[PDB]
Design an enzyme around this catalytic site. Structure first.
Site, PDB file in Angstrom:
ATOM      1  N   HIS A 216       0.568  -1.123   0.101  1.00  0.00           N
ATOM      2  CA  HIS A 216       0.035   0.032   0.138  1.00  0.00           C
ATOM      3  C   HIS A 216       0.858   1.328   0.061  1.00  0.00           C
ATOM      4  O   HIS A 216       0.228   2.541  -0.211  1.00  0.00           O
ATOM      5  CB  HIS A 216      -0.950  -0.124   1.034  1.00  0.00           C
ATOM      6  CG  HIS A 216      -0.580   0.182   2.268  1.00  0.00           C
ATOM      7  ND1 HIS A 216      -0.220  -0.937   3.332  1.00  0.00           N
ATOM      8  CD2 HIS A 216       0.070   1.196   3.113  1.00  0.00           C
ATOM      9  CE1 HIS A 216       0.044  -0.301   4.549  1.00  0.00           C
ATOM     10  NE2 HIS A 216       0.216   0.816   4.429  1.00  0.00           N
TER      11      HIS A 216
ATOM     12  N   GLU B 151       0.861  -8.522   0.684  1.00  0.00           N
ATOM     13  CA  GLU B 151       1.030  -7.069   1.284  1.00  0.00           C
ATOM     14  C   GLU B 151       2.578  -6.662   1.476  1.00  0.00           C
ATOM     15  O   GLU B 151       2.833  -5.813   1.743  1.00  0.00           O
ATOM     16  CB  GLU B 151       0.477  -6.877   2.555  1.00  0.00           C
ATOM     17  CG  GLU B 151       0.274  -5.282   2.888  1.00  0.00           C
ATOM     18  CD  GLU B 151      -0.552  -4.247   1.872  1.00  0.00           C
ATOM     19  OE1 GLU B 151      -1.104  -5.085   0.789  1.00  0.00           O
ATOM     20  OE2 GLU B 151      -0.326  -3.113   1.891  1.00  0.00           O
TER      21      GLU B 151
ATOM     22  N   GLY C  82       1.202   5.482  11.153  1.00  0.00           N
ATOM     23  CA  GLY C  82       2.557   5.677  11.218  1.00  0.00           C
ATOM     24  C   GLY C  82       3.503   4.620  11.326  1.00  0.00           C
ATOM     25  O   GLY C  82       4.749   4.855  11.473  1.00  0.00           O
TER      26      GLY C  82
ATOM     27  N   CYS D 222       3.350   1.748   9.813  1.00  0.00           N
ATOM     28  CA  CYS D 222       3.327   0.658   8.547  1.00  0.00           C
ATOM     29  C   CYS D 222       4.861   0.674   8.328  1.00  0.00           C
ATOM     30  O   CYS D 222       5.486   1.425   8.225  1.00  0.00           O
ATOM     31  CB  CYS D 222       2.357   0.947   7.516  1.00  0.00           C
ATOM     32  SG  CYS D 222       0.557   0.620   8.023  1.00  0.00           S
TER      33      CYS D 222
END
Ligand SMILES: Oc1cnc(-c2ccccc2)nc1
Length: 182
Positions: free
Chosen positions: A41, A72, A146, A148
């Site tokens: 992402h 991911e 914040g 990730c």
């Protein structure tokens, strides 16, 4: 504070950079040579900022399992003049549950941040922001925006990178040794 925080600090001090894309600032783990990982992402493009320096992306691969389900994890090769310490021998070879993990973050917003998250479950399937996702690890810590890209470790293992939360639980994508065979 103890040997878990020791291992986490050793990984942060030598194997992380601050990555910036158009989607934000992320903790980014360097694994070996010029190869690093970031949550998919982050939407890595042709250019990324690494510690506020414009860097060409030589390759970027958004990983999916053999059922064509999102994992991911994006693997990025950076046009950088320096190699990472090789930490592939700290990656697990199979999916597993863990005790006593630490989540470590280093950004402009959260410098030198370490969190004892406790027990980590092989959760498996997660609908992550509407996207079916596999190989998720779960910890019962109320992670926030914040975090990730944050590194999840135990003593002697680098097991995942933080990709999301539901306000009570946090979720990481597994790192497996087989992702980084060359
Ligand atoms: O001043 C504060 C700001 N943020 C947090 C924080 C708590 C959980 C997860 C991430 C961050 N704590 C204190």
């Amino acid at each position: 504070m103890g040997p878990g925080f020791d291992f986490a600090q050793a990984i942060m001090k030598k194997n992380t950079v601050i990555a910036r894309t158009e989607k934000g600032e992320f903790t980014m783990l360097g694994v070996y040579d010029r190869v690093a990982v970031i949550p998919t992402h982050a939407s890595v493009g042709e250019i990324i900022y690494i510690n506020d320096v414009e860097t060409r992306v030589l390759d970027a691969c958004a990983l999916r399992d053999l059922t064509d389900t999102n994992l991911e994890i994006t693997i990025v090769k950076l046009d950088r003049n320096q190699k990472f310490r090789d930490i592939r021998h700290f990656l697990p070879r199979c999916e597993d549950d863990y005790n006593d993990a630490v989540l470590s973050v280093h950004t402009s917003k959260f410098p030198n941040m370490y969190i004892p998250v406790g027990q980590v479950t092989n959760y498996g399937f997660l609908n992550l922001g509407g996207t079916p996702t596999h190989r998720i690890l779960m910890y019962n810590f109320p992670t926030r925006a914040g975090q990730c890209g944050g590194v999840v470790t135990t003593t002697g293992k680098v097991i995942g990178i933080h990709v999301g939360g539901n306000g009570a639980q946090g979720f990481a994508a597994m790192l497996l040794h087989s992702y980084f065979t060359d």
